[PDB]
Amino acid sequence: NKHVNKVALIGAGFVGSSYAFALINQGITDELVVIDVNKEKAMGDVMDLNHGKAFAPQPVKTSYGTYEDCKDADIVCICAGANLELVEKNLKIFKGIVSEVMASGFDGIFLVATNPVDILTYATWKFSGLPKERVIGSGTTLDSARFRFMLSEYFGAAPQNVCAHIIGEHGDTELPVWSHANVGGVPVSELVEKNDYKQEELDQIVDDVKNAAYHIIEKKGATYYGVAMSLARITKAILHNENSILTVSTYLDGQYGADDVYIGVPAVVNRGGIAGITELNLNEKEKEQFLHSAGVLKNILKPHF
Amino acid sequence: NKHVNKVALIGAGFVGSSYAFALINQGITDELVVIDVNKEKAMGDVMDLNHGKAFAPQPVKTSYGTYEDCKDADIVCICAGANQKPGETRLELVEKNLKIFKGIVSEVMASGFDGIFLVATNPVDILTYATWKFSGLPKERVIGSGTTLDSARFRFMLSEYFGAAPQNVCAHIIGEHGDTELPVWSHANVGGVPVSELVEKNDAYKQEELDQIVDDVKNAAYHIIEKKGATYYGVAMSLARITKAILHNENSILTVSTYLDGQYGADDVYIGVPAVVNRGGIAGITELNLNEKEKEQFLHSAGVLKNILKPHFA
Amino acid sequence: NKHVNKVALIGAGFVGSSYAFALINQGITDELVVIDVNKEKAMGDVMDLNHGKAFAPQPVKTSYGTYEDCKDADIVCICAGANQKPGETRLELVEKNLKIFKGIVSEVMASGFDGIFLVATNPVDILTYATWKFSGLPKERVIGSGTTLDSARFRFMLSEYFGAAPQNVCAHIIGEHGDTELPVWSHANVGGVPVSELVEKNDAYKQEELDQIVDDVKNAAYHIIEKKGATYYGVAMSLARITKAILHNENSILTVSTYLDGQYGADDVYIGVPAVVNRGGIAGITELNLNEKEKEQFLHSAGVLKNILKPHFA
Amino acid sequence: NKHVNKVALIGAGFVGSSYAFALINQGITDELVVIDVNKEKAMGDVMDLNHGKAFAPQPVKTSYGTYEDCKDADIVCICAGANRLELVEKNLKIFKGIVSEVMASGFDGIFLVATNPVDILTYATWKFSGLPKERVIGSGTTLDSARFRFMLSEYFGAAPQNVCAHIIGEHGDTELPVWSHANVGGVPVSELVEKNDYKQEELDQIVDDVKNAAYHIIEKKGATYYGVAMSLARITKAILHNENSILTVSTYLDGQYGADDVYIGVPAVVNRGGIAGITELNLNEKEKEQFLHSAGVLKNILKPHF
């Protein structure tokens, strides 16, 4: 009796629906159940998603469901919420959601997508009582993948042999780890000096990354395709025991001079969830940029915990 | 053009965007250009689709453009048009969409485009025929989604009934994409065993059970629409499937909208039949030997389409 | 094994090693154990296969072991045995291989193995039947490669004759893996159109051309052997294909060696017929309605096998 | 008219046959032609390889052929040659005949060289053919580096994709690990070595297994071919699919690592044009000397013949 991979999705808005469409197009899970307070929408979405079932690369059973259907889920992905005020609404929404999920007997991994992601990931860990290695937030995985790709273009190599992370809070206080950005083994700073590859050229790439989402929202009011893709990517590392290094929202206790906070850092991800935290030796600018970011978060945290 | 595939999408609504997302998720094309006069929404979608490109299985260049950017496209897929309003007849919808298609197709042809058209807009068989007339291209290079979605579904469900892989099952829905489409029970077979035989010799396999599979296939869109307001994920997948068969020269048999001049006793009409699809478009038409009931149903289905074409084309 | 697929290969000759290489190149299994008393050659092959593991699409753990290492195997594939020497009859070869299989199967069963057997050693239908008797397993869990290779090559060539994808072509070779195997022309079809109809409706499609597709399929091994001394790449691929259908629960229809107790009018014999293959092994048997000529050919083919079984099994 | 990818294989021994079986199993090329002095063996292999054609993941047309059939090949892969510094001697001759016959067909693609000693015969092929140095490529130390890389993602517990480590220099005893730039997720190996106790001579023994892997295989069954075939198919894949993958293939240097006028193993970017750029690692003092000593060994063996 071989293991059946099962994902439970909570919140069938634009992010959730797209996330589902992505799992189906990539053949990532064996089963998917969709849960939303708006029964009719989730129902319609499931039907639409199954309409083209025959064309999916791999069989995937997709169904409408309720909180109790989370019992044997490997992953519960939360895309629900509202779109200091907002943090209040969502903090409560999550409380009821995690409560209902845990009440079903779910004993898997939480994947949190709704913003502010670092905050709601910390919250989910609290409300659920699960080990911190099994509550995971999307963190800055999207921004880091982008940064990483733009650089394989810029320096002309495959993304596979290019290294670059974005860490910190998923937000304006997130930061690039220039000190460890390397191409094929060769540090970026090295390539910048030996050629005239110029500095604020690379600095502009970081500028685009941080504002990418705002610009999308400015034009169509919401962002969902890129988000959905990052979620499917993280779900893939888990379900297929990849040990992939991803800058997901992770609980720190001393690793980067930070403790008691969920924040974006490169973490090894596998079927168990977080399997280790990659500890980069930050230089001086990075070290304070980071702690400033961790401080901003922990500060919004205490009023609620 | 030589080492790289390019798709131009015209119309970035729910169908078009989902199609785009499907192409990117499955790794079907190297380049996609999105064309739509609604600039904010379309550039937004393009930026959103590019935001997460690093996660896709293959590199995919997505951009916002206009007709001039079709010059080197392998495929132009058209999802643009109006949707028919309640109380409006199909001939009334067709009058509006023909005018839209006239502008789109002439602008596309004037860009230098020399590829294949893939038509998705309803009524798809009608607009495929129009695109052929408007473009002056060979009939093999103008393709509509036809009954591909209903067939594939019909075929998966039978696979998920008689208990065998989709790949090993034969079941076609043919005719117009709409209420007169028909199942080809006479040629439906599992592993090569006719469905009528399977029914006859196992009473776990009942007729009405099978007919019910047909009832549901034909009403699936309407029910999705009831609960969600519209339907687009299935359409998008069927379009991605056809695009893949073209770009990768698969020679897959699909019930796309296809021009008939005599086959099945129908003339001068685009309509859903099993056709071989490859990099050149339509490579061949499968001519099933329809039984007497099927033949009558099919000629009625072709007639329903010709009643709509007649007032618009000589 | 819960999240992990494991294959045990018994016999690391040219067939077994190529099979191993195919599994690794296609990403079919998570683990492979190779079992062969010829230690130097087999550990050599194992080390060689591990040498380039980094380049394989998926991580594959390959090791050298013995019967005890079959305990948690999903599949045990047996390629070991002697090969027919010139002047030796098949009954004489079978006497030697039954003795070999008796030891192999009893040791495998005593390891705690509770998976599926995949048999490749010649004459495969005979040794599949023996493996069933020796193992005491359900007949659904003992599978031989049957006529899978000849069928696939019968079905690709037709696809490469009528101009369509293999996926939409239906053609089976059934019967013993050997000179009495037969084509099922009566159910051979393209997109659902009977071969006999395609023939008589187009004079570019001719009988003799089709028949020689058959004579060539049946003589393919002999010609490869003439030129290179042995045949093993095709066999290896057919085995990898069957293994994939099993490990990934495909429900693919394949003409594997299958136990019949009445179907097609044959009893108590393993023989090549279209069967549904999934994670549990044989999920179902496709019963094609053979015409009178085919029925006679098939019962003769089953008879040839029973003439070999009879002196060895009650 | 979409481009048709075409590979011509010269030498259908164990390496070539396996290399072919790999291309077919991975769906890497659209067409493959097989060429060998032993016509009947090449004919047999092609037949065996097509026997199971219906099961290949992607369509691939495989056929028997001759030097003339190289005309429109994207890639000519040479696995022919004899299997005692006279080995270089016999092979240098074989290659001369082969390249001459290939160029004489109008071939204007990329050469992929696998026959040992690969660095030397890659240099030779460049000479005999007259092609730009970016279009003659040897397998170099790609296999050894791939192993080293995987054998470290396990050790440190991450995915190979998030691990960095090269083996450079001549394909042989004088090849060397680039410890100074070996990193995991961005974190250099040295940092992890003393910060946890990951032991030094442990990571060390890994470099020893790599270098002797092939000898040990040969000790047991007489030749290596599966691993070689896999590395060849991987390089063929980077080329035909314009990957821009960084591989330590045999590459022509002119000053890049204190070395000039020599084919040797270094990380190079590989795409449809062939070598697209040479990755320049800041070698430390130890590595710098190991490397030049390796280039010297090679350049020394070249002189007598050029």
Swiss-Prot record, chain D:
It is found in: Cytoplasm. It comes from Bacillus subtilis (strain 168). Its main location: cytoplasm. The keyword Repeat does not apply. Pathway: Fermentation; pyruvate fermentation to lactate; (S)-lactate from pyruvate: step 1/1. Keywords: Allosteric enzyme, Cytoplasm, NAD, Oxidoreductase, Phosphoprotein. GO terms for molecular function: L-lactate dehydrogenase activity. Homotetramer. PROSITE patterns: L_LDH. It catalyses: (S)-lactate + NAD(+) = pyruvate + NADH + H(+). Belongs to the LDH/MDH superfamily. LDH family. Substrate binds at residues 84, 116-119, 144-147, 224. GO terms for cellular component: cytoplasm. The keyword Aminoacyl-tRNA synthetase does not apply. The active site is at residue 171. Signal peptide: none annotated. Induction: Strongly induced under anaerobic conditions. Activated by ResDE, Fnr and ArfM. This is L-lactate dehydrogenase. The modification Phosphotyrosine is found at residue 215. NAD(+) binds at residues 14-15, 36, 41, 67, 81-82, 114-116, 139. Allosterically activated by fructose 1,6-bisphosphate (FBP). GO terms for biological process: glycolytic process; lactate metabolic process; pyruvate metabolic process.
